[PDB]
């Protein structure tokens, strides 16, 4: 909720990059840094009362107070039919990165059917650092 | 919730990168750093009352107070039918990274059907550092 | 919830990288670091009362107070039918990384059907560091 960075190559606070045929003579670097971070997050002071029927007296009658009726979920449901008569395939792959007909699914249910949740929740995902290097 | 970084190559606080045919003579680096991090997160002070029928007196009658009725979930349900008569395949792979018809599924249910959860929850995932190197 | 980094190659606080045909003469590095981290997280002060019928007196009658009715879950359920008459396959693999028709499934249920959970929960996953190196 504060510092969510997607960085491409490198990250630094103080950085030097000296490359590619350069001359770097008799310099004098002098840093005097003071970097302090005082995070104080999410400090909560909650005070909740959650009743469904508080203080019913005197010959009353209640019925179907909270009814979360018929429920249906069908999250990932997909059909990929394929009807072929004659198929011929040729793949000549060199220093590549292929993916054919794969199925990558990620599903994360944090707080599903419940009642009266308090506190904090968090869901984080980051995947598939794939890589190919040829010389 | 504070520092979630996806970094590409490298991470540092103070970094030097001196590469690729360079000359680096008689310098004088002098750092005087002061980096302090005081995190104080998620400090909660909760006070909850959760009743479903508090203080019912005097010849009352209750019925079907909380009814989470018929429930159905079908999360990952997918059909990949394939009808072929004649198939011929040729793969000539060299220094590659292939994936054919694989199925990568990840499913994480943290707090499923329940009642009156308190506190904290966390879900984190990061997968598949795959890699190919040829010289 | 604070420092969740997915880093590509390397991580450091102070780093030097001196590579690839460089000359590095008579320098004078001098660091004076002060890095202190005071984490104080998740400090909770909970005070909960969770009743379903508190203080019922005097010839009352209750019925079906909390009814989590018929429940069904079918999480991972997928069909991959394949009808072939004639199949011929040729694979000439060299220094590769193949995966054919594999099934990688990961399923993690932390807090399934329950009542009145307190405290803390955590789910973490990170898989499949696969690798191929040819010279």
Q: Nearest chain C residue to A33 by CA: give it.
A: C33
Q: What is d(CA A3, CA A19) in angstroms, rounded to the nearest whole number? A: 30
Experimental method: cryo-EM
Q: What is d(CA B69, CA A71) in angstroms, rounded to the nearest whole number? A: 7
Question: Neighbours of A (≥3 Cβ pairs closer than 8 A)?
Answer: B, C
- What are the tokens at C56? 């019922």
**A119, A122, A129: residue with CB nearest C1:** A122
Nearest CA to C42 out of C121, C99, C102 is that of: C121
Q: What is d(CA A101, CA B101) in angstroms, rounded to the nearest whole number? A: 5
Q: Which residue has the tokens 């990949």?
A: B80
Distance from CA of B61 to the nearest CA of C (A): 5
- Alpha-carbon A6 to chain mean position: 12
Q: Nearest chain C residue to B58 by CA: give it.
A: C58
- Backbone φ and ψ of C27, nearest 5°: -95, 175
Inter-residue contact C13 to B12 (CB < 8 Å): yes
In DSSP notation, B110-129 reads EE-S-S---S---EEE---B
Please report how many Cα atoms fall inside a 13 Å half-sphere around the Cα of residue C135, on the Cβ side: 0
User: Any bridge partners for residue A123, and if so which?
Assistant: B123
**C39, C75, C82: residue with CB nearest B82:** C82
CB atoms inside a 10 Å sphere around CB A126: 17
- What are the tokens at C32? 């004076």
Nearest CA to B66 out of A51, A110, C115 is that of: A51
Inter-residue contact C15 to B14 (CB < 8 Å): yes
Inter-residue contact C8 to B126 (CB < 8 Å): no
- Residue C52 is given by DSSP the state S
CB atoms inside a 10 Å sphere around CB A93: 17
Q: What is d(CA A9, CA A32) in angstroms, rounded to the nearest whole number? A: 27
Nearest CA to B98 out of C8, A129, C90, C93 is that of: C93
Asked if A131's CB is within 8 angstroms of B135's CB, the reply is no
Nearest CA to C31 out of A99, B92, B100, B12 is that of: B12
User: Any bridge partners for residue A76, and if so which?
Assistant: B76
């Amino acid at each position: 909720s504060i510092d969510v960075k997607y960085i491409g190559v490198k990250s630094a606070y103080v950085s030097y990059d000296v490359q590619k045929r350069t001359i770097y003579l008799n310099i004098t670097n002098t840093l005097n840094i003071t970097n302090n971070n005082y995070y104080s997050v999410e400090v909560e002071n909650i005070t909740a009362q959650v009743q469904f029927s508080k203080t019913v007296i005197g010959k009353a009658r209640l019925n179907n107070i909270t009814i979360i009726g018929p429920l249906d979920m069908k999250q990932i449901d997909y059909t990929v039919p394929t009807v072929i008569a004659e198929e011929m395939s040729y793949m000549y792959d060199f220093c590549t990165l292929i993916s054919i007909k794969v199925h990558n699914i990620v599903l994360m249910m944090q707080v599903t059917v419940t009642t009266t949740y308090f506190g904090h929740s968090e869901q984080i995902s980051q995947e598939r650092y794939q890589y190919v290097d040829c010389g």
